[PDB]
Design a protein around this ligand. Structure first.
Ligand SMILES: Nc1ncnc2c1ncn2[C@@H]1O[C@H](COP(=O)(O)OP(=O)(O)OP(=O)(O)O)C[C@H]1O
Ligand SMILES: [Mg+2]
Ligand SMILES: [Zn+2]
Lengths: 125, 739, 99, 54, 422, 99, 149, 298
RNA sequence: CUCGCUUCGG
């Protein structure tokens, strides 16, 4: 199999097909934000602190560049390691303290990696 | 003396005895102070280094410490309690000579041009030579005596050094360690370390067809035995375990636990297991197996003489090890004295201050520096010839001896390879300067423009690598290691993770290092054959400054050099403005360097600052050395180490065992820029003679030369030889004395 | 040896028999040829090969005075008691020259 | 070739059942009877040099 | 390269923040799935997450060896014990999958559900690797050991009632050395016992084909407007760079960056000490355009003097009162007087004769050479010339400062005439 | 030995002492031969250092030009006075009665 | 290996033709030429090396091995087998050597030095063994060589 | 001359290959009289020195050829009824190398030192097809001993001398005629001499021990003389033949080639004091004291 | 003095 790229990935995911897909993206350690009234410190700002709703836009430029504008800054999104083993995204909901539910949400096929565009952050200031 | 000693004391801050608990001795802060002499009766006095030279005493400073302890369950504290003496390196931070003017140097009877950097013990000047040794915690693929291509890694932590090997003696891989009675199959070890499925092991080794073909016999040998669970492999290893001479204390016929402890701690120490989770160690041994398999085909056997794998230990690291050993011995002696005294004596409560002998540390330091033999039982290190007598034949002699490097192998035998001049010595070590004789190639000299890195904190490197998209190794199976585009990223021998598109990672890391968020001595290199990105941050690596070239134009311009000449900026300003950067040997393996501007092409990443910095200090004396044959340059380096001439401005007050002076020294007419840099012309070691090249009288047949009688009568070549005759008049134990 | 600081040892036999054995068996005149292949070892060396080569070149031509001086350079030691026997000149009509 | 048990992932060996030659796992009851031809070529390197010299 | 296409919105959902796990089987290819395999149970520990799946494998299929199944079932359990049997029937029917915890923190990982024009992210509470466990072999070996004990007891058909009364071996609770206590705490058995102390939690399995799967699949989405400005995620690129890279905590030692961090007066003093001769425009360029010219002029007037329109550092700045000549050791006051005389001569004339200065100041040759090299260059047949050209622009722009330095030089000239008897 | 560097050093030193300068023999650089040759011809000497020489002994000119110039010679610590050794009967060792 | 042999042949062609040219253009009474002709010291190869062109530097009878990855020095391209990047020294001793050529020449010199260093000890041991074995024999008066016994 | 020898390289003896130890290591190997030496060379003369086809034929006869070197593919086929290894001989390469090897020759090569593969196990189906059907040996052996065969079935010798590693066709380019010789990097002189088409009367060898054991002590002496003289000549330095002849006579005067090492010196000399002084002082002295060996002062 | 160690020389 030829090594695909994120631009072609999303382009065929939306233009060639309309079927939904489950993705597994690795975000940077700290997001470019502040814990909103989380009782603090410049500590880590992860997805656990952010609220629902639109948090950023995904830009697909010419020549295959794939960026993630998460506010003032823009990260870049690339392909992760091409996994070939089975990866099942499931929901383990302990509705009761004695009995819980495992809900197989779907299958994971491709992995994304998001990294800060350090060159832009450096030439910026 | 400013950082490391405090770290050592913090590591051993509290000492207590098992007998009589609630008794302790706690160290608070440690000081070395200024050099002093104990001649005055219970009084110190500031002493110049020349005074220590004349009196045949040591130039040392008092090691004091402030402590808190318990005499009778009442806490008693001392704010300044001497415990030892540090021999003080000349021109160091605590040396009296530092920050002094030439007039003040004359008042102290010390030559302003003296290089310093040497200890004075019992009146003699000792220099701790820079040691060279192979880097630790690195996979080395090498052929054996029988031609079998095996692997070795010397996993060394702060506590234990253990070299574990992997052999292919019968087409299958065995792991050999000093703690195992017999080498055991690698698949059994894999099963013992948590991963039990054979398919997972094969995925970790590699998915190339020839890899499976090579690794099949090991799987068959494992399947011949009934080892299929972690417990069975642990039992097998415990059977293959040997007791350390009846280790006192038995925790229930230990065996499986012994095997698991050896796997977790003793085998591959540098690879850490978080809490008995051998995933990282499994990945490391799988990578080692894969490298052995790949090297078993095309004979890409790594060479030991490559200086990217070499590390230099200076005086600081050696003194740190020695002081750690001595302080541990001192604390052990104190604890033993406490055990012997406290539980039996009297209501007169035992206190350490009456027993803290101060000659332990001082005698250890003095003996180790003077004799030069270092015996560290805590490290099982028996080194000899660490220190050497500083040679005062000439100024060049001392200066060139000050920059020497000794090899880990000795002229004890006819070795081949280290003795050779490897191309890796470029810019780092002088090619011409080597002792002509039995030690040819085993004693080397640093180049004029070189730097030895120290240790870094290693934290921000990990943080940046994690933030740069390096996937965690535990998150994926070993099959990803066999992909053509997946690159492993290491860090000081530890697998930091995996990455795709390593070009972006390397460029970002270099850009961050140039920006200043990463220490400028952190090196990053890429090995495309093994597909491994190495990040080196340990100390002892050789580095050299190079001018950064971006798109066929150097970052350094004429205006920058004009500012440097005018004093607007210094070299550190060049470092911070991304104009000049340090290159390590491993890093410069991946860079493209242009010797001159006209050599710069499209694919040039760095520019040579000055080619003549390739030569060392002694080789700098040679005028037009590029017009000669290399053996002549080596002979001249040796000869000029022995050249007669002035030593320093205080050569008259100095009393040495043997001194050679020239009556009328003259500075050379053809002087290298290296001569100007080292101020050799201030202390010349020769005379200019009107030489006529011709054959005369047949008295100059083989290397002989004819001298003019009138020239010698007029002072040419006139020399002075100073010898020393010393006597001692000592008072004996009986109150009778030499008279 | 190469006269670049090389040190040489010198023994003095203390017996007439030993002295005679040394003079006869180990005399320099008695060991001009190496035993390995009989080739002569004691022979002319640098500044003697060059000097003789320049002397015996076809360009050289000496008058009586220079030739007499060069020949008389050898008349020391055991050669003090011999007649010189100056060879007849080669070229003599225009100028008297010794090759 | 090298084949692994889908159940536990251990190596599969070749043995004989009561009807046919089958792949079997040494640590679980998984088996797989052989239906058609199965082959594993290796194509070893041939001696290509004619070895004329001088 | 503009963002031509696919300006996809990114949403965040916290509905399944703590209930979302990722299960990856390192030994199962993605083509073969566990959809058709009927699951029997799932044990799990909420803390120290370690999930154990218990699945059922069919037997009538041709890929199962019933003889080996019977043999292994007999090996693992007893003949007809069945009180604690790893297999309900007489065949190997159940398979055990055990989880290994890949990493401690999973905050940086997120599951992304993609729909037409949107991507919904959800944090993962944990990631585990499920592997086929080999635990029935350990139980088989334990049962083999107890069978061996039975065989040992079976040497005699009838065994006499053993007088094996357990003599009271109540052991001294030896006070353990703290090193040995730390070793025991770090021992694998202690950690395994601590893990086992946490009770197991049983869970039913709902496969992908279950309707509950599609029902709860909707929780990965979040209800929100298409265009909303996030209140957070507003930090500047500089702030983000500072956040993700937190800080760890000759006389020209300080760098330019360290200089710029210092107060303006110290910057001017250090620049004058390093250069000792420089124009005002160059000082404005070096300090930065953001600094007012009047403040720079005030600072330079306290550490420098005006000679031929250029600024030369004061002698006392170069030579502190405790310092002395490195070449002669004379007190710094004499050096200051000599350098003041040299600067006054340069104000009077552009060319200075070295021998005249040596005669007037009575100083050694090398000290005079050091004085001249700081501000002059050697011109053959003309002597020593001031290094910088006459700067008339600064003089024209600031006549008042020119007059200030003029009467300051008048006073210094009076002092020098008094001292050297000019 | 092909020590051309010595010849270049001699020429450069001659030129420097003639014009009162210190020439540089820096590695992979330094003063070129052409400049020192031009300095020598400017000062009235031969452009290659070789000079017409009269023999001190015979008082006659030499047939070949002689290469004159200042060379920086350095004396070594190895002296014949320190190295000269001679041994009479002398002392002997206690264990084995040998010198 | 065929490419290596061809490149070595071409470099040797350059070196020897340059030496022939320099010897042809050299005039008589040239002291190096005179000392080479009579054989007192030196040879034509030395004259060519120190006048016309130094030859290819050979380590163990081959071009310079790649100390770094796929190249001898970082100053040359990876997988570059050009003559200048593998040991050839176009410059002569009179013209002076560039730093790379100087480094290769120093490599060759150190190889020679270490070779001599090992050779001394090895031949010393061989000489001791041979003499200790052969010293007994003597040519008797009956023209028969006999052992000590 | 050992001091004088430079220990040079590139002295390939005209073949530009076949690294042969020359110099001080060569002299040390010769005088040590070691049974096995590094890089042994056997020079073989051909009956028909002019024909290249004959030279390649005899080279194939003498040179060891493995089964995997000629078989184009080896495949382990597991039919539903039986499982066996099929080997396909590449007849094109066989005739190109002119090896006298057919299917039956390979079959006879098998069943020799391969877990005692029975003759019934091996069978021939086609002209260049060999089928091997192994059976469990019951000595820790099952049918999945197939792998073992897969490990070493290509590593069985079908033709040539097993000790011989590689033989090359050297040519002498004499203006009168270009004659062909064999250079064999092997250690079996008798087998090479006995091979068809090789003029065994004029075949020499470097290993003095093999030459001695094959052709007598005088042939060993001649080989020692020729080898020492050739090694000395290779460095351009000459030694009179009388010295090397005396050395060879001393090495071969007791009927056996004895080296100059301590073992050979002990077997040659008899005086106790010299043996003690040379090497192993204590052992020699104690053995002499035990034997009561009176030593003369000859 | 004995012994070892280094640095030289060649
Ligand atoms: N370890 C040693 N063993 C025996 N003799 C030696 C040793 N070291 C030096 N010598 C003596 O010094 C001489 C070595 O000089 P040699 O090697 O021929 O010239 P060189 O030292 O290479 O000079 P160039 O570099 O050619 O100018 C020969 C030998 O008698
Ligand atoms: Mg010598
Ligand atoms: Zn299985």
């Amino acid at each position: 199999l030829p090594k695909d790229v994120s631009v072609a990935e999303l382009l065929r995911e939306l233009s060639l097909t309309k079927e939904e897909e489950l993705l597994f993206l690795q975000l940077p350690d700290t997001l470019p934000g502040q814990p909103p009234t989380q009782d603090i410190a410049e500590n880590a700002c992860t997805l656990a602190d952010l609220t629902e709703g639109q948090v950023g836009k995904l830009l697909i430029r010419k020549s295959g560049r794939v960026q993630l504008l998460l506010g003032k800054v823009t990260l870049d999104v690339t392909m992760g390691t091409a996994c070939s083993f089975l990866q099942e995204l499931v929901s383990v909901g302990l509705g009761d303290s004695r009995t819980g539910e495992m809900t197989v949400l779907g299958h994971v096929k491709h992995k994304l990696v998001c990294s800060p565009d350090f060159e832009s952050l450096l030439d910026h200031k | 003396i400013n950082v490391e000693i405090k770290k050592i004391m913090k590591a051993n801050e509290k000492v207590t005895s098992d007998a009589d608990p609630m008794w302790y001795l706690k160290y608070l802060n440690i000081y070395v102070g200024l050099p002093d002499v104990e001649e005055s009766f219970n009084v110190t006095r500031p002493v110049s280094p020349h005074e220590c030279r004349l009196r045949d005493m040591t130039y040392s400073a008092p090691i004091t410490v402030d402590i808190e302890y318990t005499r009778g369950s009442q806490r008693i504290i001392r704010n300044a309690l001497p415990i030892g003496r540090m021999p003080i390196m000349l021109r160091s931070s605590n040396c009296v000579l530092t920050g002094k003017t030439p007039a003040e140097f004359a008042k102290l009877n010390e030559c302003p041009l003296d290089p310093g950097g040497y200890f004075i013990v019992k009146g003699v000047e000792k220099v701790i030579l820079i040691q060279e040794q192979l880097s630790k915690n690195r996979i080395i693929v090498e052929a054996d005596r029988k031609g079998a291509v095996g692997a070795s890694v010397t996993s060394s932590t702060h506590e234990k050094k253990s070299r574990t090997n992997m052999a292919v003696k019968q087409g299958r891989f065995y792991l050999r360690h000093n703690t195992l009675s017999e080498d055991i199959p690698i698949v059994i070890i894999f099963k013992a370390m948590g991963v039990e499925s054979d398919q997972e092991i094969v995925q970790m080794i590699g998915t190339e067809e020839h890899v499976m073909a090579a690794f099949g016999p090991s799987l068959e040998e494992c399947q011949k035995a009934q080892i299929f669970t972690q417990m069975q492999a642990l039992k097998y290893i415990g059977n293959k375990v040997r007791r350390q001479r009846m280790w006192g204390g038995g925790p229930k016929k230990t065996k499986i636990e012994e095997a698991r402890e050896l796997l977790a701690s003793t085998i591959l120490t540098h690879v850490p297991v978080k809490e008995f989770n051998f995933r990282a160690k499994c990945i490391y041994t799988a990578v080692m197996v894969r490298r052995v398999i790949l090297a078993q085909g095309d004979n890409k056997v790594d060479d030991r003489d490559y200086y990217g794998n070499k590390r230099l230990e200076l005086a600081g690291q050696l003194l740190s090890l020695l002081f750690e050993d001595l302080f541990k011995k001192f604390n052990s002696e104190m604890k033993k004295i406490a055990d012997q005294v406290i539980p039996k004596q009297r209501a007169a409560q035992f206190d350490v201050v009456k027993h803290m002998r101060q000659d332990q540390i001082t005698n250890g330091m003095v003996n180790a520096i003077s004799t030069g033999n270092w015996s560290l039982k805590r490290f099982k290190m028996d080194r000899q010839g660490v220190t050497q007598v500083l040679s005062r034949l000439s100024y060049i002699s001392a200066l060139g001896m000050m920059t020497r490097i000794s090899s880990q192998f000795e002229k004890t035998r006819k070795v081949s390879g280290p003795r050779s001049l490897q191309p890796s010595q470029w810019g780092m070590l002088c090619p011409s300067d080597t002792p002509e004789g039995e030690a040819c190639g085993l004693v080397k000299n640093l180049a004029l423009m070189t730097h030895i890195t120290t240790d870094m904190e290693d934290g921000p490197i990990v943080k940046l690598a994690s933030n740069l998209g390096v996937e965690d190794v535990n998150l994926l199976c070993g099959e990803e290691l066999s992909y053509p585009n997946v690159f492993l990223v290491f860090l000081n021998g530890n697998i930091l993770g995996v990455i795709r598109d390593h070009k972006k990672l390397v460029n970002t890391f270099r850009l961050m290092r140039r920006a200043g968020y990463i220490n400028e001595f952190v090196s990053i290199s890429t090995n495309l054959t093994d597909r491994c990105v190495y990040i080196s941050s340990d100390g002892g690596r050789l580095c050299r400054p190079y001018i950064i070239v971006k798109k066929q134009k150097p970052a350094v311009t004429n205006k920058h050099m004009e500012e440097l000449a005018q004093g607007y900026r210094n070299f550190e300003d060049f470092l911070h403005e991304s104009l000049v950067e340090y290159l390590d040997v491993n890093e410069e393996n991946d860079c493209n360097i242009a010797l001159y501007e006209h050599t710069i092409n499209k694919d040039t990443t760095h520019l040579e600052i000055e080619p003549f910095t390739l030569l060392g200090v002694c080789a700098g004396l040679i005028p037009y050395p590029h017009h000669n044959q290399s053996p002549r340059n080596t002979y001249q380096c040796a000869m000029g180490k022995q050249a007669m001439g002035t030593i320093g401005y205080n050569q008259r007050n100095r009393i040495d065992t043997l001194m050679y002076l020239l009556a009328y020294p003259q500075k050379p007419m053809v002087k290298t820029k290296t001569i100007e840099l080292i101020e050799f012309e201030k202390l010349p070691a020769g005379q200019n003679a009107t030489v006529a090249v011709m054959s005369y009288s047949g008295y100059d047949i083989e290397d002989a030369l004819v001298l003019n009688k009138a020239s010698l009568d007029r002072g040419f070549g006139r020399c002075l030889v100073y010898k020393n005759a010393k006597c001692t008049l000592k008072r004996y134990t009986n109150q009778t004395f030499d008279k | 040896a190469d006269f670049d600081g090389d040190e040489m040892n010198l023994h003095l036999p203390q017996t007439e028999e030993a002295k005679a054995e040394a003079l006869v068996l180990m005399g320099t005149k008695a060991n001009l040829v190496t035993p390995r292949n009989g080739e002569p070892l004691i022979a002319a060396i640098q500044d003697f090969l060059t000097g003789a080569y320049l002397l015996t070149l076809k360009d050289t031509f000496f008058d009586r005075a220079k030739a007499c001086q060069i020949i008389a350079s050898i008349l020391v030691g055991k050669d003090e008691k011999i007649k010189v026997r100056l060879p007849p000149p080669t070229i003599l009509k225009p100028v008297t020259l010794w090759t | 070739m090298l084949l692994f048990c889908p159940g536990c992932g251990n190596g599969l060996i070749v043995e004989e059942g009561q009807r046919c030659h089958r792949f079997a796992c040494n640590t679980c009851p998984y088996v797989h009877n052989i239906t058609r031809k199965v082959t594993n070529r290796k194509y070893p390197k041939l001696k290509e040099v004619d070895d004329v010299l001088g | 390269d503009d963002p031509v296409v696919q300006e996809i919105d990114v949403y965040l959902a916290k509905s399944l923040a703590e209930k979302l796990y990722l299960f990856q089987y390192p030994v199962r290819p993605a083509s073969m799935t566990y959809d058709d395999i009927p699951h029997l149970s799932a044990k799990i520990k909420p803390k120290q997450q370690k999930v154990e799946l218990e699945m059922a494998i069919d037997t009538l299929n041709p890929n199962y060896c019933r003889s080996k199944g019977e043999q292994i079932a007999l090996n693992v359990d007893g003949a007809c014990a069945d009180e604690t049997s790893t297999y309900s029937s007489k065949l190997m029917d159940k398979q055990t999958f055990c989880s290994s915890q890949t990493t401690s923190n999973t905050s940086r990982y997120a599951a992304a559900l993609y729909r037409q024009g949107e991507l919904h992210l959800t944090p993962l509470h944990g990631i585990l690797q499920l592997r086929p466990s080999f635990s029935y072999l350990d139980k088989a070996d334990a049962k083999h050991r107890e069978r061996e004990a039975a065989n040992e007891a079976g040497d005699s058909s009838q065994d006499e009632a053993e007088d094996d009364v357990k003599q009271i071996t109540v052991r001294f609770s030896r006070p353990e050395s703290e090193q040995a206590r730390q070793r025991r705490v770090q021992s694998y058995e202690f950690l395994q016992k601590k893990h086992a102390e946490e009770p197991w939690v049983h869970l039913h399995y709902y496969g992908l084909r279950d309707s509950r799967s599609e029902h709860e699949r909707q929780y990965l989405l979040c209800p929100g407007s298409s265009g909303v400005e996030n209140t957070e995620l507003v930090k500047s690129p500089s702030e983000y760079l500072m956040m993700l890279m937190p800080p760890s905590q000759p006389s020209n030692v300080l760098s330019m960056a360290q200089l710029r961090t210092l107060p303006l007066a110290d910057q001017i003093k250090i620049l004058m000490k390093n250069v000792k001769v420089m124009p005002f425009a160059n000082l404005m360029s070096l300090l930065g355009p953001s600094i007012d010219s009047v403040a720079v002029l005030r600072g330079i007037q306290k550490v420098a003097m005006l000679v031929q329109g250029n600024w030369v550092v004061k002698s006392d700045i170069l030579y502190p009162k405790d310092s002395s000549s490195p070449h002669s050791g004379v007190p710094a006051e004499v050096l200051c007087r000599g350098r003041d005389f040299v600067m006054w001569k340069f104000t009077q004339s552009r060319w200075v004769v070295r021998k005249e200065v040596a005669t007037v100041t009575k100083l050694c040759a090398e000290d005079v050479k050091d004085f001249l090299e700081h501000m002059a260059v050697v011109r053959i047949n003309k002597g020593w010339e001031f290094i910088l050209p006459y700067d008339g622009e600064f003089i024209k722009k600031h006549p008042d400062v020119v007059q200030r330095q003029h009467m300051l030089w008048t006073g210094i000239q009076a002092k020098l005439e008094k001292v050297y008897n000019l | 030995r092909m020590t051309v560097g010595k010849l270049i050093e001699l020429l450069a030193g001659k030129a420097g002492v003639l014009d009162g300068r210190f020439h540089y023999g820096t590695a992979f650089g330094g003063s070129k031969v052409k400049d020192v040759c031009e300095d020598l011809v400017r000062h009235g000497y031969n452009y290659l250092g070789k000079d017409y020489v009269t023999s001190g002994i015979t008082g006659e000119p030499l047939e070949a030009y002689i290469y004159f110039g200042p060379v920086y010679y350095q004396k070594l610590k190895h002296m014949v006075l320190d190295k000269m050794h001679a041994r009479a009967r002398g002392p002997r060792a206690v264990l084995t009665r040998q010198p | 290996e065929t490419l290596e042999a061809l490149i070595l042949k071409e470099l040797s062609v350059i070196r020897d033709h340059a030496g022939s040219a320099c010897l042809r253009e050299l005039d008589k009474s040239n002291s190096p030429l005179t000392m080479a002709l009579c054989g007192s010291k030196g040879s034509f190869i030395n004259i060519s090396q120190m006048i016309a062109c130094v030859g290819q530097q050979a380590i163990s009878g081959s071009r310079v091995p790649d100390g770094f990855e796929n190249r001898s020095l970082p100053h040359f391209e990876k997988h570059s087998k050009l003559p200048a990047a593998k040991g050839f020294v176009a410059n002569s001793f009179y013209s002076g050597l560039t730093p790379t050529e100087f480094f290769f020449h120093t490599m060759a010199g150190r190889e020679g030095l270490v070779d001599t260093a090992v050779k001394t000890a090895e031949t010393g041991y061989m000489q001791r063994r041979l003499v200790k074995s052969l010293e007994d024999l003597c040519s008797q008066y009956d023209l028969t060589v006999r052992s000590s016994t | 001359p050992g001091t004088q020898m430079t220990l040079k390289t590139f002295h390939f003896a005209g073949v530009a290959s076949m690294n042969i130890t020359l110099g001080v290591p060569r002299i040390k190997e010769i005088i040590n009289a070691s049974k096995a030496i590094s890089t042994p060379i056997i020079t073989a003369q051909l009956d028909k020195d002019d024909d290249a086809d004959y030279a390649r034929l005899v080279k194939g006869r003498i040179e060891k050829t493995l089964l995997g070197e000629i078989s184009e593919y080896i495949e382990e086929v597991f039919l539903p009824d039986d499982c066996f290894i099929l080997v396909k001989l590449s007849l094109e390469r066989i005739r190109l190398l002119r090896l006298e090897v057919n299917a039956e020759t390979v079959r006879y090569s098998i069943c020799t030192s391969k877990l005692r593969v029975k003759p019934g196990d091996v069978a021939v189906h086609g002209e260049a097809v060999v089928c091997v059907t192994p059976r469990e040996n019951s000595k820790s052996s099952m049918y999945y001993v197939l792998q073992f065969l897969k490990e070493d079935l290509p590593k069985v010798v079908v033709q040539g001398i097993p000790e011989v590693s590689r033989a090359v066709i050297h040519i002498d380019e004499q203006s009168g005629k270009e004659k062909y010789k064999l250079l064999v990097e092997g250690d079996n002189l008798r087998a090479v001499m006995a091979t068809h088409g090789v003029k065994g009367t004029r075949t020499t060898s470097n290993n003095t021990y093999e030459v001695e054991k094959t052709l007598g002590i005088e042939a060993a002496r001649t080989t020692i003389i020729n080898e020492i003289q050739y090694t000395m000549v290779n460095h351009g330095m000459s030694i009179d033949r009388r010295h090397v002849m005396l050395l060879s006579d001393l090495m071969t005067y007791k009927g056996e080639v004895l080296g100059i090492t301590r073992f050979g010196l002990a077997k040659m000399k008899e005086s106790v004091l010299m043996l003690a002084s040379f090497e192993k002082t204590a052992d020699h002295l104690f053995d002499a004291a035990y034997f009561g060996q009176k030593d003369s002062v000859c």
